[PDB]
Design a protein around this nucleic acid. Structure first.
Ligand SMILES: [Mg+2]
Ligand SMILES: [Mg+2]
Lengths: 124, 124
RNA sequence: AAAAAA
């Protein structure tokens, strides 16, 4: 058996047949490193006032912000440890066979992710 | 000319802008990715409540290498003056579509849950 | 794996 270590900032709950398995969120919020891309503004109608250009909002948009890396970097592989991260992180480290993501997600009444029915990992 | 933002994601999207927030209601129906089954296995994991005790280890389903097949529902057809808010993972799978954006530069609460975004992102 | 670290 392996120890699961949650690198994601939210609590991860795996809904298993005998009851849930709960992994606490990481102590520090991790981040992706992205380029700025081309910084523009998108004029959007205020959903409160549809079709009224007079009271349209200016929304910042990053056009083509690109993956530069992650901060912090992945922890080194440790015997008997499997790291729970995001799929997007795992896909950027395909050599790592100790990375999984929560998968087959469960959402609440507000459409927010609250759990997962399984883990996923890259082809091996 | 301003555009109408349409939220295709199941959660409420809040863009935290300088003049006040812009709120987009969640989609009425929870959309899903279509994935292959991959190789279905089980991962023996220590119960975080009882670390290192193999006796009370849990069995976690894992899908190894489940692959993108498509989406259900499909994207709405392009409409003049409409921009669709979706996930980055969906947008990246439809690079020809220049009317897709995702929420970006995310804000997380004390429990590590996404509660807002400071900008939009789109492909180069 | 549908809110660039579920
Ligand atoms: Mg809803
Ligand atoms: Mg996501």
């Amino acid at each position: 058996p392996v120890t699961l270590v949650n690198l994601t900032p939210a609590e991860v709950i795996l809904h298993l047949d005998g009851g849930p398995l709960r992994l606490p969120g990481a102590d520090v919020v991790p981040r992706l490193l992205l380029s700025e891309g081309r910084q523009e503004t998108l004029a959007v109608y205020d959903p409160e006032r549809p079709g009224e250009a007079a009271v349209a909002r200016e929304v910042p948009i990053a056009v083509g912000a690109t993956w530069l890396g992650i901060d912090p970097p992945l922890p080194e592989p440790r015997p008997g440890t499997v790291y729970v991260t995001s799929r997007v992180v795992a896909e950027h480290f395909p050599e790592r066979t100790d990375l999984v993501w929560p998968d087959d997600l469960i959402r609440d009444a507000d459409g927010q992710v609250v759990g997962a029915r399984r883990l996923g990992c890259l082809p091996r």
